Design an enzyme around this catalytic site. Structure first.
Site, short mmCIF file in Angstrom:
data_model
loop_
_atom_site.label_atom_id
_atom_site.label_comp_id
_atom_site.label_asym_id
_atom_site.label_seq_id
_atom_site.Cartn_x
_atom_site.Cartn_y
_atom_site.Cartn_z
N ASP A 1 0.83 -1.20 0.00
CA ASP A 1 0.00 0.00 0.00
C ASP A 1 0.87 1.26 0.00
OD1 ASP A 1 -1.92 1.92 0.31
OD2 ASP A 1 -2.41 1.42 2.39
N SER B 1 -0.62 15.67 -11.94
CA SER B 1 -0.87 15.31 -13.32
C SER B 1 -1.12 16.57 -14.14
CB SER B 1 -2.08 14.37 -13.39
OG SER B 1 -2.51 14.15 -14.72
#
Length: 330
Positions: A35, A199
């Protein structure tokens, strides 16, 4: 040193991925959920409340000659999906894909929430976010990656998740055969303890690319792609019959649909998520309403590039002094 381990979807939907991990001496192999959105290595154990164990493999520290109670240390974690676990702490030898760390904090669960009990395939979590998020008190502990880093050939790990197929976590090297083209690296902020990056925009299907900064985290422990409501609405508007259902808890779409791809930007590069990756199947057994793999982050407080996004790429988690993230197509 290096390590290389195969990671395998837990079910037909790629709800999560499990990777075998050797703990203790002699080895006890548990299948852990790696994770990158948390920083605790915790396991079902001989100390876990018996009624909360349902099929998991447990770590038994009393059977390990290298286990030592970390006296006075406790831990307690709550995850984004509302699940939780807590307990006490041992140090022991932990190996992943041939890479060994001695003195790793292994957090033994005394209690786990129902979501964990109900998932018989996940024996615990191995956190790969920054150690500043680790929950052990009163002495915070380091992640497996942080402990291994100095010994690694290169201070990196990579995630190569499969779509309905196994993939790979590598530590200490970049497998140049595992991706196509070049790797595009992008800046990381560690301010919130995550692999947080920005992004450069998105496209829906064959549509034009929208240049827009989307701050979010690379999180292998989250199944879906969670993005701003504007972006998610633009995506689902291209699917006839798709709608946001408060009763279901997000966007659903007709199971008869063909889903468009979704592209996200990494610098000047582009990662394309095929439409099929966005299908999470019937909302309930036999339903013709299907659950979407792109959902709104509104009210989460952060955008999350979860497995839906990451499995479309070869992803480098660069833990050099100034960390960065790399993405390549594959």
């Amino acid at each position: 040193s290096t390590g290389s381990a195969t990671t395998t979807p837990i079910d037909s939907l790629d709800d999560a991925y499990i990777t075998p991990v050797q703990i203790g001496t002699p080895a006890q192999t548990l299948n852990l959920d790696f994770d990158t959105g948390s920083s605790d290595l915790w396991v079902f154990s001989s100390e876990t409340t018996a009624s909360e164990v349902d099929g998991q493999t447990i770590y038994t520290p009393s059977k390990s000659t290298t286990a030592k109670l970390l006296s006075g240390a406790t831990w307690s974690i709550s995850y984004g999906d509302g699940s939780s676990s807590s307990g006490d702490v041992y140090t022991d030898t932990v190996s992943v894909g041939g890479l060994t760390v001695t003195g790793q904090a292994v957090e033994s669960a005394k209690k786990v929430s129902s979501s964990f009990t109900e998932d018989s395939t996940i024996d615990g979590l191995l956190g790969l976010a920054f150690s500043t998020l680790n929950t052990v008190s009163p002495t915070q502990q380091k992640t497996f990656f942080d402990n291994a880093k100095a010994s690694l050939d290169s201070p990196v790990f990579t995630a190569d998740l499969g779509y309905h197929a196994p993939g790979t976590y590598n530590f200490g090297f970049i497998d140049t055969t595992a991706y196509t083209g070049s790797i595009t690296y992008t800046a990381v902020s560690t301010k919130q303890g995550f692999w947080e990056w920005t992004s450069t925009g998105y496209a829906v299907g064959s549509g034009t690319f929208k240049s827009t900064s989307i701050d979010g985290i690379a999180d292998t422990g989250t199944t879906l792609l969670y993005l701003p409501a504007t972006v998610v609405s633009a995506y689902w508007a291209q699917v006839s019959g798709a709608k946001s259902s408060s009763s279901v808890g997000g966007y659903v779409f007709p199971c008869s649909a063909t889903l468009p791809s979704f592209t996200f930007g990494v610098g000047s590069a582009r990662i394309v998520i095929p439409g099929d990756y966005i299908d999470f199947g019937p909302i309930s057994t036999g339903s013709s309403s299907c659950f979407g793999g792109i959902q709104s982050s509104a009210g989460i407080g952060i955008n999350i590039f979860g497995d839906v996004a990451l499995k479309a790429a070869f992803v480098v988690f660069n833990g050099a002094t100034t960390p960065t993230l790399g993405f390549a197509s594959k």
